[PDB]
Symmetry: D2
Subunit: 132 residues, 4 copies
Amino acid sequence: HHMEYWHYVETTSSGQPLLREGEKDIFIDQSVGLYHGKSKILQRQRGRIFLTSQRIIYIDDAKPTQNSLGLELDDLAYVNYSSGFLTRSPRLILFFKDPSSSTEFVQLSFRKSDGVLFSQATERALENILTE
Amino acid sequence: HHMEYWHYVETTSSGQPLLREGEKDIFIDQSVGLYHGKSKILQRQRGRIFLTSQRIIYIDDAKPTQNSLGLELDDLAYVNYSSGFLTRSPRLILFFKDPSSSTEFVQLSFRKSDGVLFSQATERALENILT
Amino acid sequence: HHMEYWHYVETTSSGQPLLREGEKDIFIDQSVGLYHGKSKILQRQRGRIFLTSQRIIYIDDAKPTQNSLGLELDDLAYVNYSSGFLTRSPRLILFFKDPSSSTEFVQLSFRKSDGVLFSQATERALENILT
Amino acid sequence: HHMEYWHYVETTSSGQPLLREGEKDIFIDQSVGLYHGKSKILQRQRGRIFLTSQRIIYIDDAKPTQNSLGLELDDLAYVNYSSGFLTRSPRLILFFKDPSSSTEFVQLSFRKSDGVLFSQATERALENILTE
């Protein structure tokens, strides 16, 4: 289940995430869907994606105050961009430090952008945490 | 930087590695080279690669008692096979649980086989450890 | 759009394809599905895949005398194996010499094998035609 | 040999390509190296790359009037972007309509950019020719 790694995120009525003390937004993209391993996360297929200094946050388009999710950058070891040759959309693949299985990873799927600026910003934000 | 993750492996002159208490031989392949991230590990470009129940072990062809190295399966998180379209040889990429940088990962490069059987065995060996 | 590139293949009721003058059986794999570009070919999702000296032939499991198709090796330019990290199954991707669009290419999807032996045989069969 | 597919291109002293009647530049990138199949093209490792309505053109940094090369878009069937996971630089892979072997293809290697805008423009320019 994807909830071992993802946590619930509160938002305003308008779909703005409520961020932690000193947590700052770095980048945002639109119309992103989530995967857990190779499978779509049902009902989390169209949202805005936010990168912060601490987290990747998915804000559900349809029900932002219910279906929004967060992932800690501190739980990640690598991110890898995949450009959409076999997949309909380009994908950003997130690798965890401590997966329960190699089947457990996340993907962000970009339906209205190539996802390149988001992925580049995420690579940098991850590297800042890793190198410390 | 590769020595953060790999350890020295004692062998014999004929290239037989010293295994641990209860550590079992699973699969071996020949003429493998090692990468650390995108770069070749310089003195480790032609060796046998050995999968055990606990480790991946590189046994150097030219200098086995000196240049042989081991990696704990317990330090890995994911594995990915790449078939060699843009690389001279197929590659098995290994991702650490705890990399100091996301530029640090392992590749095994298969110069005289396709590396499929070795990669499949490693997938299974790693999954046994994770689960 | 896939019917620009694939042709109808006559079989028998037991799923044996009608081969041409001097056309020889090279390799077969089971439980394969077909793609045209990124999309599944709808009635061609479970069949045997057959490499001959001249063609790749899909023999449909459910309706072999109706839904079986052939592709000329002479219409291909490149082949690429993808190991199935993000796809449920490994894929063999085939690139046409003369695509109407660069969105048009073939995939074979291997549901009950890794497709390596079939892919390796196809690489060789295609190279024989090209050279 | 890479010269079955590539042709000589004339330039000005300053390294500006001399274009055909009605041929127009679409995009340019810098610090690109060439591959023929998996191997570097020696001495064609640092140049500007130009996309035109008809061609991809490599302008050699060191000797532009001698070592510049052109490829016809009409000789291509596909282009594929590869994002630099195993390769030091991202790559744009060019597939020919009529290779003599599957070992014969070209790569553009991007040493000072991610090559994304160039690759996107090339995909579009190719598609215009293919669809006719």
